[PDB]
Write a protein that binds this ligand. Structure first.
Ligand SMILES: CCCCCCCC/C=C/CCCCCCCC(=O)O[C@H](COC(=O)CCCCCCCCCCCCCCC)COP(=O)(O)OCCN
Ligand SMILES: *[C@@H]1O[C@H](CO)[C@@H](O[C@@H]2O[C@H](CO)[C@@H](O)[C@H](O)[C@H]2NC(C)=O)[C@H](O)[C@H]1NC(C)=O
Ligand SMILES: *[C@@H]1O[C@H](CO)[C@@H](O[C@@H]2O[C@H](CO)[C@@H](O)[C@H](O)[C@H]2NC(C)=O)[C@H](O)[C@H]1NC(C)=O
Ligand SMILES: CCCCCN1C(=O)[C@]2(COc3cc4c(cc32)OCO4)c2ccccc21
Ligand SMILES: *[C@@H]1O[C@H](CO)[C@@H](O)[C@H](O)[C@H]1NC(C)=O
Ligand SMILES: *[C@@H]1O[C@H](CO)[C@@H](O)[C@H](O)[C@H]1NC(C)=O
Ligand SMILES: *[C@@H]1O[C@H](CO)[C@@H](O)[C@H](O)[C@H]1NC(C)=O
Ligand SMILES: *[C@@H]1O[C@H](CO)[C@@H](O)[C@H](O)[C@H]1NC(C)=O
Ligand SMILES: *[C@@H]1O[C@H](CO)[C@@H](O)[C@H](O)[C@H]1NC(C)=O
Lengths: 173, 120, 1230
């Protein structure tokens, strides 16, 4: 089923970037009618500006110059029960760096009931020039190499020790 | 026939209170919209029936002139009870009292008949 | 002993008899037994006459005996019949002469058989009054003649001294009460007329001994029933304290208008629609969705809060609210009937953490107690059978043609030719499916014709060679003639008849020894145990007609409580057929689903009485029959230095333990690879690199093992071969990953073989090595019996395909999923028009049916494991034709096909299974020096030192202290009256814990609190009293140590309740602490020796069960990883809900423990089978993942679930049973 996976927090200059905002229902069987809005502030600036509003089927974006001609939808297609509100930036600039907020306006449908939920997903991304490898990846790689080398040295140490012992046992025979 | 328990003959002293006790029993659980109870009086065996109390979503007391305001409901129908009370019974109250109970979903209609006799 | 020796009953002889009484048993001559051959034949002038008593032990008393033509003995008293008629009187003479007669016996038998035929009418016509009058008259007449022959209450051998006449008396008394002035309960009085069907138990020969043997077996089952009640009660108190009111959770609304409150609603709403308008009610269920406060149990949809309010699920009968309902739910878990629904409901209500409670309850209560009942019934029957056995012991042209026919009948080759023809005809009839082109149909038809012609020619040749007389003298030949007649009748002149040639395959029995064993079982069912199967049939009939008479009035009257269309449900008791089907379904373990409906319509008291009588009685007899059948069946050279060093390294215990730890780590690193692995990317990375570390370590271990053992010693070892295979697969995967250009097809499909990495633990853990050795030793008989079962179910599945091939299609309406009324849209042609007109209709199959023989095998697996059979039985009995809309119970008698299948396939073949498997385990136990085959060596040492505890030796009681008041205390403590007083106090604490319930008064809770306080006070007082008595030697008894422990735990439970009340707030942990007081109850097994023996048997079987549980846990782990790999992302259709799916390791191991008892495996498999839309979606999005499609592989799903069923059968139903049986024998013998 759905997985609420956090978005990547490191966009690279001049290339593409998909900002994940995944807000799936607490019960998958219910049928809702979801639309979303995205707000954004550049780094070093203190307000929030709506950039695009996705609706029943079409994506309407505000007339800010920062995101004109370089934003396309990436969430669920043709569902009308969106359950995944993921914006895709093409040709990221140095202005797509700051705090994004993914407002999810879900309207569930029940027997005699129409609930109006609103989960706010906040994504902070920073644009850079070169893809920086994760500290987790680099430290786990060097740790794997260290463990492999330590196991090799332990094995050869025990090997040469038992070899000297076997040679000493054979010398007496 | 529906299981309705009433005394076939009920003998009451003039001036006392007469509880007309009837037991209706059917499967299922009673429904307020669903459960309907009707009580009628007759002065004699062949005499026209006069409805004097009904249950239709609640008790309706028809306040027949012949009873003044002496009729009261005296039963909790959810208990299969639909008894009525006739306060301060008078000689003219002698006659036949009929309880009719129709209970959805039960198709069958219960009927209890009491012959009330007034002593002296 | 001489023919002249016996003398007719004369007054002169009786005059001597009375004198011997005035002066003051031979089993061979017992009444009813056959007269021994020693006395020879009876002269015709003395038969059916009173004779002098031949037994001198009885000859003193006033008795006499009358002989039947068949040499049976009948004993009567010589007194006048009710002080009226002496034996010399003429009336009593003719009365006895007609009493002792096979004509009269068979008259009564046929009369009560016709009465049993008439009892099943369920709405008899007007004229049955004179039939019942005739039956009552015949009964009164036979009772009258036996009264005239014996005497009512006067005498030693009077009519009443034997109990089987009490029933004949009661039945006529009740019949005449009914005819005369009768009470108001006409139906509950007509129910009492069923004892006419018990009359045959005494009329028919032998049934009177079979029932006596059953009553003897119950006398042994007594102690296991006591322990069953005690264990169900202890686990019911635990389940009560845990889930009191948890089943009452319901996800309630949030936005209430008109100031409407929870209570203001609950007091005013009662209809299910009004309920559904406020609570969740998940789209088609009768009860609201269970909710949860705890994080794991979950989850109610946005806009709904969790609150415990309303009625419990399943009309109110599925709950742990009161102790009675907790006991009923734990009996439901102990008989494992629909226990998967209770599993899922209480887990959703409380949390997925209580899988621990359900594992304990199943793996102790259900399995251990059922295997204890089996072991005790087995021991009882075996000892009874052993005791019985020991105490018992043209014409010339015609002759030329016949010679030539015998010469060409070629015995050494024609028998084999006909066997090959039989097998070919079977494999030719098994090549039939629903969608068949006309060429295929014609091929099948001409093949059937050719085969039936071959068999007819062979039969006529054999007849003319051996002829009509000596030929038909043989059973197989008369059987083949019957079959060839049944096949030739349809040459040019029904398919149930057509499916009868398959029985010819039993001609393999003369060559196939295990098929011969199956024939022997089926024949012992109607032979040596024919009387026992007749008792079973009579009991099933009695219970069926009793259920009918008691509940068929209400069912018809009050259908709406148990159904929404106000029509009869699928399983009712309004007809004799459906009543019998319900009794059969309760013989199988499926009692509760119908007990709920029958309770709803006809009262809990009556339905509980009837269903518990059915369950207990009918299961006991069935169990006895199963046991009887099964038992009866049994009886420079630097390279060499390098090799030595690396061999020492490999054999080093440090290296062995390190490799075991790395195996455990590499196995546990698979549990993290679920759908939530896109999150926790750091753990994802450390796993992606630990994978390479582990692959390298295992490659180095393999190279060390090579250089240390040599290719010979290495590849001559199955464990090393398994390790080599797993490491080679891992190396292929690593090389592909590191080289690239490999993310396609085979590589991605062998990456999931990483689920086999746990298999490296078998070679290391001795507790799994021993179990795997035992199973691998047993596997040849498994193969033989699986082959026999395959051929038998092939017969049944060819029949099933011929009957239900392509008739399961229906016009479901996809919104609610309800068959169209078949008045409109009667066939597929109109269904397609309705599909053009509307959107939500779909001509859909069942996905598990008899469309071909493979699907037939699957449907039969479901019908024979009883988990998923109702959905097939319904559509079968509704089937009409090949392309017609099914009508509601239009066939209604393929229920007979499924009953016959269950009885033969499931019962008999599973009996063959258990028998051959326990027999193979006994052969292995013999071959291995007689020591147990499920324990390692350290476990065997532990087991011997533990069996030492079974000593009956009385130890030195105590040295009494010299101090006077201390010795007074010592005596008052050592008093047996004091001991029994403590026992009764424990029983009073037990009922104090039982009286609790959900929704009790605050005053009641306070009184129970203070009663518990006084109980703990008394217990601690007697403990410190025994201490002041025996300061030094109190702790030298394990039972006294346990008493000290449990009183400490009780006082600290009170103190912890105090400390929580002060500083903490946690209902769950508070409850689990309060669970401590079950210790104060568990002190009852101290005096109950019959319980203390079976508990010692369990303590004996604990190590072997630990090894079997280790193997089962490793198999469950491998299958859980295979699940998380394949069956994640599948559609959530049924049984694969939000909870209990295959998404993560928790959910996968939960579903797998559910399936470990075979429960609900049909529901778990159903969403996987669907593919090829519109049954699924092959390109879904799954937000948060890159995998598309939400349907699983049908083939891999069938293989997964069927292989897990078979494996967890082998391991859990045939090794748990074997361990329990051997260890219980060990316990009870010494
Ligand atoms: C928290 C625990 C979770 C459960 C995990 C599953 C583990 C399975 C546990 C099974 C418990 C089985 C222990 C039974 C031990 C009782 C044996 C016993 O008392 O025998 C006696 C041995 O003496 C002792 O060892 C005393 C030691 C105290 C034992 C405490 C007994 C507690 C009973 C627990 C009940 C078990 C479950 C019952 C239903 C929940 C002597 O035998 P005998 O009376 O002379 O009879 C010989 C006949 N020829
Ligand atoms: C299949 O069943 C659904 C309901 O179970 C039917 O839907 C109903 O249709 C009628 C008239 O078409 C409406 O008045 C109801 O309001 C509908 N109910 C619901 C719950 O939607 C549907 O019509 C059925 N299919 C066909 C072909 O009749
Ligand atoms: C399948 O069912 C349909 C509808 O009942 C049958 O339709 C026939 O043709 C028209 C269509 O309604 C009717 O006027 C005829 O009376 C129907 N024939 C009969 C015998 O009822 C159709 O015959 C059925 N069988 C098929 C299509 O093989
Ligand atoms: C082809 C052989 C298929 C195996 C059939 N199979 C069962 O029938 C049960 C399901 O129903 C049971 C009821 C019991 C029992 C075992 C089972 O032992 C105690 O009572 C089971 C549990 C685990 C693996 C297999 C099975
Ligand atoms: C992004 O746009 C710039 C021009 O503004 C262009 O030079 C560059 O090639 C583009 N990059 C991609 C990946 O489209
Ligand atoms: C990004 O911001 C800078 C200064 O803040 C501005 O000069 C530039 O025009 C912005 N980008 C676009 C596409 O307008
Ligand atoms: C997101 O949009 C891009 C087009 O800019 C497309 O190539 C990509 O497939 C989309 N992603 C998803 C998941 O649909
Ligand atoms: C409530 O729903 C309306 C549309 O029905 C929407 O415009 C509004 O934003 C929603 N508000 C919240 C808090 O969800
Ligand atoms: C519906 O009927 C039309 C003819 O009117 C036919 O062309 C079409 O194939 C049909 N489709 C279905 C789905 O029945």
């Amino acid at each position: 089923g759905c997985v609420e996976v956090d978005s990547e927090t490191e966009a690279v200059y001049g290339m593409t970037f998909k900002i994940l905002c995944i807000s799936c229902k607490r019960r998958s069987e219910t049928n809702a009618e979801t639309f979303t809005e995205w707000t954004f502030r550049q780094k070093g600036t203190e307000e929030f500006v709506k950039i695009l509003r996705y609706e029943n089927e079409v994506l309407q974006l505000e007339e800010d110059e920062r995101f004109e001609g370089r934003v396309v939808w990436n969430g669920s297609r043709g569902t009308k029960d969106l359950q995944d509100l993921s914006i895709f930036i093409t040709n990221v600039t140095y202005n797509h760096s700051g705090d994004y907020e993914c407002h999810v306006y879900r309207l569930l449908f029940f027997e005699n009931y129409e609930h109006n939920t609103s989960v706010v997903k906040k994504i902070h991304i920073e644009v850079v020039d070169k893809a920086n490898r994760d500290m987790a990846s680099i430290v786990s790689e060097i740790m794997m190499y260290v463990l492999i080398v330590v196991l090799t040295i332990w094995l050869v140490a025990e090997m040469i020790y038992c070899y000297k012992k076997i040679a000493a046992a054979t010398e007496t025979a | 026939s529906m299981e309705v328990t009433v005394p076939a003959t009920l003998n009451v002293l003039n001036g006392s209170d007469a509880r007309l006790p009837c037991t209706f029993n059917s499967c299922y659980t009673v429904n307020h919209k669903q459960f309907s109870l009707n009580w009628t009086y007759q002065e004699c065996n062949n005499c026209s029936e006069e409805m004097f109390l009904q249950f239709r979503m609640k008790i309706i007391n028809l306040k027949l002139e012949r009873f003044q305001d002496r009729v009261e409901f005296s039963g909790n129908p959810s208990k299969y009870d639909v008894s009525v009370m006739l306060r301060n019974v008078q000689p003219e109250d002698e006659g036949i009292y009929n309880c009719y109970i129709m209970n959805p979903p039960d198709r069958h209609r219960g009927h209890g008949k009491i012959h009330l006799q007034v002593l002296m | 002993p001489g023919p002249q020796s016996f003398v007719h009953f004369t007054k002169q002889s009786l005059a001597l008899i009375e004198q011997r009484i005035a002066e003051r048993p031979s089993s061979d001559l017992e009444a009813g037994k056959q007269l021994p051959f020693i006395y020879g034949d009876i002269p015709p002038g003395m038969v059916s006459e009173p004779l002098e008593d031949l037994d001198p032990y009885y000859a003193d008393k006033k008795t006499f005996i009358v002989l039947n033509k068949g040499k049976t003995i009948f004993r009567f008293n010589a007194t006048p019949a009710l002080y009226m008629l002496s034996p010399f009187s003429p009336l009593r003479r003719i009365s006895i002469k007609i009493l002792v007669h096979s004509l009269f016996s068979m008259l009564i038998m046929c009369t009560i058989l016709t009465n049993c035929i008439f009892m099943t009418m369920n709405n008899p016509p007007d004229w049955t009054k004179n039939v019942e009058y005739t039956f009552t008259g015949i009964y009164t007449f036979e009772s009258l003649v036996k009264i005239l022959a014996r005497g009512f209450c006067v005498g030693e051998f009077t009519f009443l001294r034997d109990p089987w006449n009490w029933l004949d008396f009661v039945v006529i008394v009740f019949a005449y009460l009914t005819e005369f002035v009768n009470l108001g309960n006409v139906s509950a009085l007509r129910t009492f007329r069923v004892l006419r069907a018990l009359k045959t138990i005494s009329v028919i020969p032998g049934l009177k001994t079979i029932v006596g043997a059953l009553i003897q077996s119950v006398k042994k089952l007594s102690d296991v029933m006591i322990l069953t009640v005690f264990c169900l009660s202890v686990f019911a108190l635990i389940g009560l304290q845990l889930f009191m009111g948890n089943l009452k959770h319901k996800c309630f609304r949030n936005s209430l208008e008109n100031n409407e409150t929870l209570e203001s609603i609950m007091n005013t709403l009662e209809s299910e629609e009004d309920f559904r308008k406020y609570f969740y009610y998940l789209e088609g269920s009768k009860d609201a969705l269970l909710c949860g406060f705890s994080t794991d149990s979950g989850q109610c949809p946005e806009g709904y809060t969790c609150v415990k309010i309303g009625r419990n699920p399943d009309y109110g009968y599925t709950s742990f609210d009161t102790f009675s309902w907790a006991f009923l739910a734990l009996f439901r878990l102990m008989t494992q009937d629909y226990w998967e629904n209770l599993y899922q409901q209480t887990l959703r209500a409380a949390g997925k953490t209580y899988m621990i409670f359900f594992v304990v309850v199943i793996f102790l209560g259900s399995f251990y107690l059922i295997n204890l009942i089996l072991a005790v019934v087995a021991m009882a029957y075996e000892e009874q059978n052993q005791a019985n056995i020991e105490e018992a012991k043209c014409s010339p042209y015609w002759i030329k043609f016949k010679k030539c026919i015998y010469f060409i009948v070629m015995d050494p080759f024609v028998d084999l030719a006909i066997t090959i023809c039989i097998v070919l005809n079977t494999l030719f009839m098994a090549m039939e499916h629903h969608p068949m082109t006309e060429e295929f149909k014609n091929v099948l038809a001409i093949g059937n014709l050719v085969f039936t012609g071959i068999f007819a020619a062979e039969m006529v040749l054999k007849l003319i060679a051996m002829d009509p007389y000596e030929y038909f003298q043989v059973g197989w030949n008369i059987f083949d003639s019957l079959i060839v007649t049944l096949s030739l009748v349809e040459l040019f002149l029904l398919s149930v008849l057509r499916s009868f040639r398959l029985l010819r395959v039993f001609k393999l029995a003369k060559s196939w020894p295990t098929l011969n064993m199956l024939i022997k079982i089926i024949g012992n069912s109607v032979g040596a145990l024919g009387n026992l199967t007749l008792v079973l049939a009579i009991i099933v009939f009695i219970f069926a007609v009793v259920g009918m008479q008691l509940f068929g009035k209400s069912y018809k009257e009050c259908v709406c409580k148990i159904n929404d269309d106000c029509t009869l449900p699928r399983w009712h008791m309004n007809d004799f057929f459906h009543s019998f089907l319900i009794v059969f379904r309760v013989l199988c373990g499926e009692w509760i689903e119908t007990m709920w409906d029958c309770m709803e319509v006809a009262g809990q008291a009556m339905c509980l009485i009837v269903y518990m009588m059915v369950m207990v009685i009918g299961n006991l007899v069935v169990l006895n029959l199963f046991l009887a059948l099964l038992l009866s069946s049994f009886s420079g050279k630097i390279w060499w230095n390098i090799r030595k060093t690396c061999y020492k390294i490999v054999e080093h215990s440090w290296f062995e333990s390190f490799i075991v730890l790395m195996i455990l780590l590499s196995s546990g690193a698979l549990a993290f690879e679920d759908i939530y692995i896109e999150r926790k990317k750091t753990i994802k990375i450390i796993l992606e690199y630990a994978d390479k570390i582990f692959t390298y370590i295992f490659i180095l271990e393999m190279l060390l093992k090579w250089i240390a053992y040599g290719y010979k010693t290495y590849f001559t070892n199955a464990w090393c071969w398994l390790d080599f295979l797993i490491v080679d697969v891992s190396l292929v995967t690593l090389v592909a990953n590191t080289l690239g250009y490999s993310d396609l097809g085979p590589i991605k499909s062998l990456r999931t073989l990483r689920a086999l990495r746990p298999l490296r633990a078998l070679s290391r853990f001795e507790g799994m090595r021993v179990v795997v050795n035992a199973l691998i030793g047993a596997i040849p008989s498994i193969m033989n019996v699986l082959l026999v079962c395959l051929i038998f179910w092939l017969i049944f599945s060819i029949m099933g395909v011929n009957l239900f091939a392509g008739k399961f299609y229906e016009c479901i309406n996809t919104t609610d999923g309800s068959r169209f009324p078949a008045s409109q849209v009667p066939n597929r042609s109109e269904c397609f028009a309705l599909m053009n007109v509307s959107q939500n209709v779909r001509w859909k199959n069942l996905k598990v049916n008899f469309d071909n023989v493979g699907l037939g095998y699957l449907s039969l697996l479901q019908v024979a494991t009883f988990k998923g059979w109702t959905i097939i039985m319904y559509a079968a009995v509704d089937s009409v034709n090949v392309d017609k809309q099914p009508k509601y119970e239009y066939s209604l008698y393929m229920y007979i096909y499924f009953v016959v299948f269950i009885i033969f396939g499931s019962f008999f073949t599973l009996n063959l299974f258990i028998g051959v498997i326990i027999d193979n385990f006994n052969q292995q136990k013999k071959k291995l020096g007689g020591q147990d085959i499920f324990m390692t060596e350290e476990q065997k040492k532990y087991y011997n030192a533990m069996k030492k505890l079974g000593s009956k030796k009385p130890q030195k009681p105590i040295p009494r202290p010299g101090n006077k008041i201390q010795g007074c205390i010592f005596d008052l403590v050592t008093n047996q009256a004091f001991d029994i007083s403590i026992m009764v106090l424990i029983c009073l604490n037990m009922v104090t814990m039982m009286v609790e319930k959900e929704g009790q008064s605050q005053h009641m809770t306070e009184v129970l609190y203070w009663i518990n306080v006084v109980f703990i006070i008394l217990f601690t007082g007697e403990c410190v009293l025994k201490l002041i008595s025996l300061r030094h030697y109190y702790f030298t008894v394990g039972w006294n140590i346990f008493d000290f422990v449990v009183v400490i735990i009780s006082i600290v439970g009170m103190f912890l309740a105090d400390l929580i009340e002060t500083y903490f707030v946690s209902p769950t942990l508070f409850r689990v602490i309060r669970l401590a007081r079950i210790g104060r109850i568990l002190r009852l097994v101290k005096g109950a020796k019959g319980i203390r023996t079976l508990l010692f048997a369990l303590m004996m079987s604990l190590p072997a069960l630990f090894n079997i549980g280790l193997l089962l846990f490793l198999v469950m782990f491998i299958y859980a990883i295979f699940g998380m790999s394949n069956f994640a992302y599948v559609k959530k259709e049924d049984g694969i809900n939000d909870m209990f799916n295959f998404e993560t390791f928790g959910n996968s191991m939960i579903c797998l423990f559910q399936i470990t008892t075979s429960a609900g495996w049909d529901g778990l498999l159903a969403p996987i089978l669907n593919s090829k839309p519109p049954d699924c979606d092959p390109k879904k999005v799954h937000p948060g993942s890159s995998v598309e499609g939400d349907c699983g592989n049908p083939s891999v799903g069938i293989f997964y679930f069927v292989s897990y069923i078979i494996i967890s059968f082998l391991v859990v139903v045939n090794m748990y049973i074997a361990v329990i049986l051997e260890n219980f024998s060990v316990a009870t013998e010494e």
